[PDB]
Design a protein around this ligand. Structure first.
Ligand code: HEM
Length: 375
């Protein structure tokens, strides 16, 4: 197998060989350090003074938070933060419920059995991001096409450049409308707070980064999440009670499934000794978030999904100053999807108990390509 250890999974778990990798070891044509222990990953990601983020990494946008470190990163994140406050996330909840129920309506109309990934997992995330950004409902299909299209390598140059011209024109008019009268969306929140200090280029950059950062991780979580819950049916009761129970179940699913294989690679800013290893200035460190969230020190049963467990402080959203800017949105979106899904389809089940599981192996986030369910 040519695939790097950190990208290997076995079912819903990290592959056995990744789970047996030491806390911090060398892996290889580039050679890097691979961190698998929870405390080592926390040390690497939390210490931005010794470990900077590799720039222009792909699992160049202006104001792409992942490219900078404090203080430059701190100023940029500060500027974007207004679009992600907890009070603003609370106000999104009804909109997110409506998006989810509109997709569950299309699935319901198609009839049992149906593919949950095509109807729900692959559609809800981008619609929630459009809602967050401030894109008008009737423009969302077009917006998703323009945004991903201007970055689609499989297209012809002519096609990709035309989509990019349209995307720019669309974004700039949206930005001008928000500056004139700020709305409740992300752009409006940034310009309401910082006005002209937030440049059009920064805003365009913030928009693209967010569209890219909150899509695959969420669709992977919706698909894998439903599959995990169906495999542990008694635990579905956590989505049939109070909000706190549902929130704890979402956090547990996020930890147990850890869809991102790794955060941005980190570069040693100088020589240092970590976990008994000699790290030299310039060395690259890849953090296996899935392995770190299965660290035996975290719990005797860290390898089991248990939505009622004493919560385990996981690294699936990262750690330190770059900790996922959309984490609260993600938790809310996921809780909404699962709560509404089981409210609508109480008898949800795999369409065929013996059906194969179709894993999504081509994306930076683990997930499913299809999931046939009955109800
Ligand atoms: C369950 C889903 C999600 C997971 C597991 C996830 C995971 C992560 C991780 C691991 C990082 C840190 C990367 C690093 O330190 O190198 C990160 C950063 C980030 N995430 Fe997420 N994310 C999710 C959903 C979202 C959503 C929905 C949004 C957008 C609304 C989002 C926006 C971002 C942004 C902008 C950053 C960069 C923050 C910074 O560099 O300061 N994420 N995410």
């Amino acid at each position: 197998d040519p695939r790097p250890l950190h990208i290997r999974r076995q079912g819903l778990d990290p592959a056995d060989e990744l789970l047996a990798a030491g806390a911090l070891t060398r892996v290889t044509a580039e050679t890097h350090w691979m961190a698998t222990a929870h405390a080592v990953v926390r040390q690497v990601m939390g210490d931005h003074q010794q470990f900077s983020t590799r720039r222009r990494w792909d699992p160049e946008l202006v104001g792409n938070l992942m490219d900078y470190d404090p203080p430059e990163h701190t100023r940029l994140r500060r500027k974007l933060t207004p679009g992600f406050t907890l009070r603003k996330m609370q106000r999104m909840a009804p909109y997110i419920e409506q998006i989810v129920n509109d997709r569950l309506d299309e699935m319901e109309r198609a009839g049992s059995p149906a593919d949950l990934i095509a109807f729900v997992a692959d559609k809800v995330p981008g619609a929630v991001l459009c809602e967050l950004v401030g894109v008008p409902r009737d423009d969302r299909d077009m917006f998703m096409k323009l945004c991903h299209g201007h970055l689609d390598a499989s297209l012809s140059q002519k096609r990709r450049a035309a989509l990019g011209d349209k995307f720019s024109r669309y974004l700039l008019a949206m930005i001008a409308r928000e500056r004139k009268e700020p709305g409740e969306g992300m752009i409006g929140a940034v310009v309401a707070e910082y006005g002209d200090d937030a440049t059009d280029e920064e805003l365009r950059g913030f928009c693209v980064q967010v569209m890219l950062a909150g899509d695959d991780n969420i669709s992977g979580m919706i698909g894998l999440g439903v599959l995990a819950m169906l495999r542990h049916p008694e635990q579905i009761d956590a989505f049939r009670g109070d909000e706190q129970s549902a929130q704890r179940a979402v956090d547990e699913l996020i930890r147990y499934l850890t869809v991102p294989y790794s955060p941005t690679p980190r570069i040693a800013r100088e020589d240092l000794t970590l976990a008994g290893q000699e790290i030299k200035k310039g060395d690259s460190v890849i953090c296996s978030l899935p392995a770190a969230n299965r660290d035996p020190a975290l719990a005797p049963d860290v390898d089991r999904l248990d939505v009622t467990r004493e919560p385990i402080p996981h690294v699936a959203f990262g750690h330190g100053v770059h900790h996922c800017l959309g984490a609260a949105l993600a938790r809310l979106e996921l809780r909404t999807v699962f709560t509404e899904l089981w409210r609508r389809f109480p008898a949800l089940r795999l369409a065929d108990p013996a059906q194969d599981t179709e894993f999504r192996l081509t994306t930076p986030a683990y997930g499913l390509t299809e999931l046939m369910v009955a109800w």
